[PDB]
Amino acid sequence: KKGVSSTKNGRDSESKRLGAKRADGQFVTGGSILYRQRGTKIYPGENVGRGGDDTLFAKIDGVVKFERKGRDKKQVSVYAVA
Amino acid sequence: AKLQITLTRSVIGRPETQRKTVEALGLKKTNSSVVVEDNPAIRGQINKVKHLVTVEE
RNA sequence: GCGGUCGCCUCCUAAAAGGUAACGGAGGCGCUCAAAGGUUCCCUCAGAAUGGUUGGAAAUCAUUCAUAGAGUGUAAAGGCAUAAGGGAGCUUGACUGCGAGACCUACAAGUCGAGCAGGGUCGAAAGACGGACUUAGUGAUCCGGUGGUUCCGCAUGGAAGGGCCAUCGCUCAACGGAUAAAAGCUACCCCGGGGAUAACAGGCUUAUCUCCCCCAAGAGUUCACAUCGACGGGGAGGUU
RNA sequence: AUUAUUGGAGGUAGAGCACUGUUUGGACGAGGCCGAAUUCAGACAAACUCCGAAUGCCAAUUAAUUUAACUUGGGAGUCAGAACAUGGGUGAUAAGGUCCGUGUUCGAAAGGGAAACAGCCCAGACCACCAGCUAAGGUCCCAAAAUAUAUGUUAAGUGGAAAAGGAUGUGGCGUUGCCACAACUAGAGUCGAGUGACACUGCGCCGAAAAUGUACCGGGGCUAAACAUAUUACCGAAGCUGUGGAUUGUCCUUGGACAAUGGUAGGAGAGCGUUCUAAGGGCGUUGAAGCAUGAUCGUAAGGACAUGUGGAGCGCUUAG
RNA sequence: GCUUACAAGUAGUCAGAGCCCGUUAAUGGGUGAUGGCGUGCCUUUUGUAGAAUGAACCGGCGAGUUACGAUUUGAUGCAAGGUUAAGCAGUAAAUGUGGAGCCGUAGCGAAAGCGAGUCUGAAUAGGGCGUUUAGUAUUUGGUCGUAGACCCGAAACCAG
RNA sequence: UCUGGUGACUAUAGCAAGGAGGUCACACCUGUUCCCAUGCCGAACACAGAAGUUAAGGUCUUUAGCGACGAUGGUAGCCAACUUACGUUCCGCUAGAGUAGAACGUUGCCAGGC
Lengths: 82, 57
What we know:
This is part of a larger assembly, with chains A and B.
Chain A: E1 19-20, E2 27-28, E3 33-36, E4 42-46, E5 48-49, E6 56-58, E7 62-68, E8 74-79
Parallel strand pairs in A: 4-8
Antiparallel strand pairs in A: 1-3, 2-7, 3-6, 5-6, 7-8
Chain B: E1 2-6, H1 16-25, E2 33-37, H2 40-48
Antiparallel strand pairs in B: 1-2
The structure holds four RNA strands.
GO molecular function (chain B): structural constituent of ribosome
Protein name (chain B): Large ribosomal subunit protein uL30
Family (chain B): Belongs to the universal ribosomal protein uL30 family.
């Protein structure tokens, strides 16, 4: 019944939909998106490139391949095979 | 090399996943049988939707 | 009702794809920078003690233990010794016209992109650059004002004026913005509705409330179990 | 769409102390009577990770089954949800509380069991029958089917409603040890036959007080008609089978089929009857329309035909 | 005519003696000693036997319509074409006559403009919308727009 | 086949001790006379030369004490499933981390004086 002492909270922001966008072993187009994330969780490998410090995209057609780089770091690649 | 499953239970009250598998085999209504060949992909289908049908021969 | 909030950014809840609520738990933004921007070189973190006017255990450069426990202009997470961290020269790409394809998504928006022409800075060069390590730092349309303004300018041509192209100013923070001109009281109140929603009684629940135990600390000079009853624990009742 | 073999993305349950923060102590340095930080063992974490499943998700251009799927247009309704079982937040590991996540049922679902009980268990009604086999739950009487068989457990009516505790309760699991222990006594000697702590138990006992009337086995009643197992037999639904018929959509390309037929808001299709008009052909004082009664005909809305009352109009076929 | 004074009842329905009947002639009709099963109807709801709303009973009356447009579907006529309006001589005959007009056969761009291509602009390059052409007149069904627009009902405002 | 040089592997590839050899080739070694240049001192950044040496590095061989990879047997957790009221328990699948016994002082790619 009594006007309460209110809440010093309540704020948040819209989610960005990060993660993988193309599956390993499937065929693509030149220029398609493969992953979206802050910082380089998965490095760009063969015939792929990093955009503006994110969006690892493909540069030529073919099939994608996820792989390990050194000991603890991964990478993505595309091969021309048809 | 030849099996014949038989629905001995109802498919009402279970999840949709099992409902699809039951129709995937060919079983329609209750107390129904279907003779098919024994394959590795058939044994795994009856293993998922178990305690509902009866395998023999 | 009073009070506090209303937009955008980061994390936890969120159950190893994405998405996911509450007046759930924590912090931030309404910028700043000619350099903290582009290019070519060059270098390297903490918590560690040495005994050095002086010492403020810490005012110094070393030296070695130094594994990122450091530093990033700004909160938080994800990243980085390619250093994305620390300096040095040169310069203005913080360029014009385009862009196959894809992510997100009710819609309006929003995000990334090989490469194609033109002109250039940097480097011997291969090459690299369409603003700051990444994600916040604004707000449609209408109207009004400015300049260049291969278009229509109406009986002909001039011609205020409209239109394409490029800028500028309010304030819409209740931040998808009712007309960018908006305070109260009804104990005389009136109509349309609702147990979708309060006051009385019923039902569920038992924090508090009233009992009953459990351990017994303490009170009786003896006798913790005559009696009182410290904290703590376990139940019952539905009469506050 | 599901399944079998394979590839990949990720950081939860659980673990762990290798970073961050927080702790308990034993030996550990840090004044002139008792300290910073550290060190060998360790402990805790929604905003701590050197680690890390099951399940789900995206691809597989891989076989076996199965029957959807996408694009454009016509027409919609919905924006108050609820309980049960799990995974969390919030509150008081309070609520038939409240907000999200994954399923099923109700909503829009009849039938059988839970004594009566939208959400719990079993199962999805096209219609006829005085046919048969089963599911959950059951078999002394009310009330369909065993007063069945074999083995144990239980003396409370436990079954047929709560806890910390308490104890010379106990059937099973191991001890421990006197060859004394029940009548000895220190606050020493015999005679004759079982004694106990402890440990895991399974079933009991006490803890247990409420207002109209026995008063939660549903009632009578039960020492098995209770509990834990085993095997059987039989009963039990509108589930399945047998026999005849109706509609579909298929199919084959004339009737055997193949399947299918709960339903609210809604979408689609085929029909019945009422008043008037047109054309053709009809009925009527030898009695029209209306009204009353009847044991008749069609899958439904409905349609004929006799008989009584009534005294002047009214049907049928095709179309509007 | 048949039935009823030991009985607990949404009044029915399934089975079933006895006592009377005799039809649209058929595995007929009326009455009901006993037995099993069973909490009306409409509205509004997560949920109603509800102690939530409405109706005493019976009869008569009482709620998606028409005019002009837009879009889509079926039907028919002609087909790169299709078709008329107001009129005028006529059974208020709705068949003749009437070619102002309307849609389609070619789009793209703010426009001037060019045209199977056009704008883009420094770009014929890459892209956007086009090109491969079936439509049209009347009528039938579905929905929508402007009118009161499915029907009934307010507190109140203004004029004389 | 030894060393020097390029390109694969999850530190099995290590830091912690040492052992022993040579300068064919990596090294310690001379200064600013020059190319470049430390806002700071040619130790890094450069030059001509090497009379002098093998410590160290460098390479093998030793230490499983120093740390990762860590095959089984279990077990927590979990997906179905039948029960009961769950902080459970039974029944089927997949079964971890940590703990051991271990492997453990890299397999090579392709060239140069041989």
